[PDB]
Symmetry: C4
Subunit: 365 residues, 4 copies
Amino acid sequence: YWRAKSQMCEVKGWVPTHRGFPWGPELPGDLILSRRAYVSCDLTSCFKFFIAYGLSANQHLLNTSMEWEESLYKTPIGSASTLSTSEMILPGRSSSACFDGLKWTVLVANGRDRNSFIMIKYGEEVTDTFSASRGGPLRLPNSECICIEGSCFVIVSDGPNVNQSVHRIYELQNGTVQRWKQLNTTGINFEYSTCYTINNLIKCTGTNLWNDAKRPLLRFTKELNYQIVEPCNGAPTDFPRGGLTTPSCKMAQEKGEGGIQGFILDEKPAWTSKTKAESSQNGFVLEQIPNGIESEGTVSLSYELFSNKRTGRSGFFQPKGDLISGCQRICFWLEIEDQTVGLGMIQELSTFCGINSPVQNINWD
Amino acid sequence: YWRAKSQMCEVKGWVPTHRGFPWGPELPGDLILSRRAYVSCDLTSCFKFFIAYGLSANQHLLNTSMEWEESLYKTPIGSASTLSTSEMILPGRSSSACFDGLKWTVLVANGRDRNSFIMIKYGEEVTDTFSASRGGPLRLPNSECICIEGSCFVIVSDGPNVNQSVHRIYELQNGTVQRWKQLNTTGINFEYSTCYTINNLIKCTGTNLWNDAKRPLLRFTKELNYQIVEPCNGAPTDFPRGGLTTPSCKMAQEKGEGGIQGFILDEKPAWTSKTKAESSQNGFVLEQIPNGIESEGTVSLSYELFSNKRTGRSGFFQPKGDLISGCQRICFWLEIEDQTVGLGMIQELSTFCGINSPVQNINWD
Amino acid sequence: YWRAKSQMCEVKGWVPTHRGFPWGPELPGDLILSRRAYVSCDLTSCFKFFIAYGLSANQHLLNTSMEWEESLYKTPIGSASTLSTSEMILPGRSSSACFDGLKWTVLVANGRDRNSFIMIKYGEEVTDTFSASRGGPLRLPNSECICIEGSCFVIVSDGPNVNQSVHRIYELQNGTVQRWKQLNTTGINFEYSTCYTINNLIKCTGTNLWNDAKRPLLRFTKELNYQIVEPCNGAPTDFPRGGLTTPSCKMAQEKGEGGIQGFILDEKPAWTSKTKAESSQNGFVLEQIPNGIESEGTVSLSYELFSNKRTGRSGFFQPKGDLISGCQRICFWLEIEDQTVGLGMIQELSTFCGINSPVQNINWD
Amino acid sequence: YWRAKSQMCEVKGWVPTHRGFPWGPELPGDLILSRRAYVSCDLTSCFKFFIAYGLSANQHLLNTSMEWEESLYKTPIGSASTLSTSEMILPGRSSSACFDGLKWTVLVANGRDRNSFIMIKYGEEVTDTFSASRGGPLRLPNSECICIEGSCFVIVSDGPNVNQSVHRIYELQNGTVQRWKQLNTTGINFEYSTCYTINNLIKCTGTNLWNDAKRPLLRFTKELNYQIVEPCNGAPTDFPRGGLTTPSCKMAQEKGEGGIQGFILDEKPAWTSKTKAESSQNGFVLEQIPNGIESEGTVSLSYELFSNKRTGRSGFFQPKGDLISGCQRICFWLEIEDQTVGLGMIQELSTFCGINSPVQNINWD
Ligand SMILES: *[C@@H]1O[C@H](CO[C@H]2O[C@@H](C)[C@@H](O)[C@@H](O)[C@@H]2O)[C@@H](O[C@@H]2O[C@H](CO)[C@@H](O)[C@H](O)[C@H]2NC(C)=O)[C@H](O)[C@H]1NC(C)=O
Ligand SMILES: *[C@@H]1O[C@H](CO[C@@H]2O[C@@H](C)[C@@H](O)[C@@H](O)[C@@H]2O)[C@@H](O)[C@H](O)[C@H]1NC(C)=O
Ligand SMILES: *[C@@H]1O[C@H](CO)[C@@H](O)[C@H](O)[C@H]1NC(C)=O
Ligand SMILES: *[C@@H]1O[C@H](CO)[C@@H](O)[C@H](O)[C@H]1NC(C)=O
Ligand SMILES: *[C@@H]1O[C@H](CO)[C@@H](O)[C@H](O)[C@H]1NC(C)=O
Ligand SMILES: [Ca+2]
Ligand SMILES: [Ca+2]
Ligand SMILES: [Ca+2]
Ligand SMILES: [Ca+2]
């Protein structure tokens, strides 16, 4: 029964733990094509979880992209996702996974419309199911769920419309629903939750696909007492987004429609993340805000990890081990396009971890 | 030495535990082409057992189908069957496998006509063999055999014609025949047995390729006391089959010739399974019958798991693990054709398990 | 420290433990091309050892023959030999391997002419070497060596001509030469030795590439005391060979030139093995000779395991486990050509094991 | 906490432990293209560490060479480097790795110019980083670092010019820098360090890319007492290089510019190694010098391992196991070009180990 360590490690920079090489114009045939990938770790190692939809042998024979028969797979971090290296878990359209210290809890959502429902698996057996309450498709955040002392927490979205979506925090134990809390999210939309835990608190960053280019933030406790916070920055981090504005706790309404999964490290000094410019989905920059993200958006540190690389989803994951540090590490994963492979068929899932040491502002392009 | 749990779990729905993604028009070269696949589990995991006949590199260069040199292979469930993931067991045309709690018992049948015989393997070494007694080829049901308290049970078929076939129960211990019992099957044919065990009883659903579109049923004990039963329904579940009829315990003679391996769960409420319509081998529907299958056929629940998918063989398997449930779960596997792969070269072996919860009538096409 | 059991199992039949399926006209690219393969087992599992010379991707681009940079590899029996499944051991032109109960002893011979020498590897490390003493290339038998109580035995051949070859028994312990004894093989030639042990005795079948169509026999003890025996049969088993003649302890001179690796199970009763007819290298027949091989060759049992399949090298291996038998099992491996693959690039290494029961004369084509 | 044993084994010859077969004109698609490979072993086995830049599927579609996004990978020695067999460690341009008895210490350098820095990883987690001190890029030697009693040592090079490079010994513990020592290397250049240890002495051979065709030598202790030595030979071993000269301890300045990673075994008899001739990068010859390398270059033994084979980088590795010798074995790795594969896309990483027995002067072409 894993607990996050006593304190957050001081973060002064981010270094990549996983970053591969170009898989070239032509691919081998046994690679699995994926989307909505994320990272989750057990006590020894970390894993890629992804929604598989095709084989690389059909690189040029498949629609881009395909909303057909999709299935959740897992692959050891460090290994390429192939038919010989990857393991099927469940059929699914979106998913979440987490390790409690004993077993893996895996959630998948299947179906669109009212027939949509969620399956929960706990170490090799399906343990629980529940159906949609609000008509629309049930949606999992495609990110690590969070486990504390045998209790796992995950946010499920429901509702057919972005202008009337509902969102719930579910508490699970052994793959069984114990209880949930429906959130008052009126006025906003909270999709693609990516979360992390610190000192028995869970902090999640959301994505507003409706009316905001700023990212809504969620903080809650084991008793599901919650608070939703809006960044008091003037710098939107969603994509798409508008330009800089005067700092205020007002939502960023310009180009609020749309969005992509992304993260905000809501701590004592805060870390923000976004594409380099709002005109294009290229590059990735991390910026430190000492007074927190509920302050004015005053940047002390700015790292440009990528300049030209086409960038996509990003989210948190926490390594559950660290036999060397007495502090709780924080890491994030990030989709980067292998431009040597046409049509965005290959989004590498890169990973970065925070370090207590400052680092060069190196470009990883 | 595995023992079955006290009672069957209450089943209100079926959820897929295995369901993959389209393998596209073109396949990679190292995939193994298979037939007669089924599922069997040990204490930790489940495995696909199949008769291998070719490689995917020769997808368009092979006779279809090839009843040449065929060989029994095994693959961890969740992994694709490739030359690097699949493992040779024995040469064979049909097979059965079961795990007793200590070692695997594997049976294979080889040869046609009078030279036909069966090899029995028990944990890495071949321990016993026996020959055809009735001239024709020895035939195994291509499904999990049943092990109880160190004793494993399997049904063996013999005879060159379906209109005078013979069927026997063999009892094994440490891969050696302890004794056998020939069943009185006059008037019927009982091929492709798929079985499960509960409270010292083994129940098998058979397939009549001769004169019945209903599925004959078998119940027996460790002492080889048996009873053969005909469904008193009016709704045939075999393929091919005729239309709905007036309920009776009489066989359905309309389109009785031919058949496909299939299952009937005869418990306190019973579960029946079949293609959606008799006109085509498409779809798959599960129907619940509260009064048992020897009653009149009154349906309470009807789940249409597939509508358009081309459907094939189905049969039982029981997971021998389940650390969350104290009752005996039941699962089935089902061949579903990957329509993106031409000529039915790919039958995915999907799996469904029963749950105590009611679930949506979702289409898994 | 593994020891062979007290007694030989009574053998009345042979059953295939390994026999695969056609790999078709076209192969996937990652298969390793091999020759001089054989089988050897540890306490748990068995392995294929082979001399690798190429990749299947160059199936149609490689010369016959290419006697070039060759390397000894190993692959778990039950797996195809591929780049992801096979493991390099040592560079080598011929080899021998045996497991002592703790570690593997592996021998390879490299070089032609006088620069030829042998490397001995004992669990990941090279432990001893010795060079050619008699001018010609050093040759290992390409079959399992034999270990008894930590002492391992292998026959090494030397000399550039078959009419003046020399042969020595080397006794090794911990991968180091303890002693060797040169055999008086004057008048004959003793290549391609395949051996098995029973009751502290080692029995080997040789191949005469010079002047005999019969297979010479060797029997020796841990103390390197030996006896060389000629079959008193009238039925030669080498290939090529002449027709049947009157039984005598005389060599079979017709077509004595040339030969192929093969085995004779010399016990009481003895088993002989050979091609179906002397005109062609198709098929394989096992014949039982009750009074031993030093008698006249009166056959009681005759099995035609293959009829049309092209047959090649064959030799012994002993499974070192068997927790079901108190007797020593005996098995043989056999090259069978996959005729679906052109130019004999694929020699499937099938394996047969002896059983205490008589079995049907089934054709395994 | 592994320590190398008391004294070096007497070395009279070198035998290949790894030497493969031609991978032919055409390669399969899933092979990883590599550069800067070296070998390092744990308690059980040895591993290939390399810088990956591409896939073999793009054999004819890739530039030679590719200075793009490079990543450090590892593969079990004996296995081919494939997407299914190789594992990503860290992104990197050059690297070093060593095993302390518990965990792997891995260092990689990224960036050119002033942004260059090094990451240190200790068992699955990043533990330390440090940046350039001298403007130019940080460089690791692309060879095994050295661990003694929990202390690991590696040479880090810096400076944008060969005519004023700096080199430091770093001491690491648990993936953490304890201290570092800058060497006085004024007048020379010390790149591509390959090192080995004996009884608390570390001996490294360097490569001078600036003004020397002899290889600079380094000797140091756990407490960083060090000495830089020049061979008093008359035979330069670097490539490129000029011809033989009169023995002296002065640098060989003819063709001193440039160089290639190479090794010198400085022991009580010394061993030198180099290409066959200075005219071309073909062949490899090992020469023994009884009075040590600070003596006159008097050769007693000369082995020509290769004549025609194109040869590249070479360096040391030590097996940390070996239960047959009570003495410390020494091994080296050697890049050899697979000439059946065009454009030197395949550099096989061959390995040789020293032995106390004399061996034939056999050519491994
Ligand atoms: C549901 O939410 C609305 C508006 O959105 C809220 O979302 C959260 C981030 C929360 O912390 C809150 O600060 C934020 O405004 C709530 O409306 C607020 O309160 C009153 C309600 O009459 C109104 O003035 C506005 O809608 C808004 N406040 C301000 C200052 O404008 C609303 O109260 C809440 N409903 C419930 C269930 O209490
Ligand atoms: C540093 O060294 C300079 C030359 O010393 C020689 O060259 C180096 C590379 C080593 O091989 C060393 O053993 C040689 O003796 C000196 O000229 C210089 O004064 C030295 N500087 C200091 C501060 O000691
Ligand atoms: C066997 O079964 C048939 C039909 O079920 C039945 O009529 C007959 O009595 C049985 N035969 C014997 C010998 O009991
Ligand atoms: C690949 O790289 C360059 C372009 O960067 C290309 O012009 C050339 O053909 C290839 N390599 C070189 C530098 O020769
Ligand atoms: C290095 O790490 C170990 C634990 O891995 C611990 O003893 C301490 O942190 C250091 N110990 C030594 C002996 O170097
Ligand atoms: Ca938005
Ligand atoms: Ca029928
Ligand atoms: Ca012969
Ligand atoms: Ca130089």
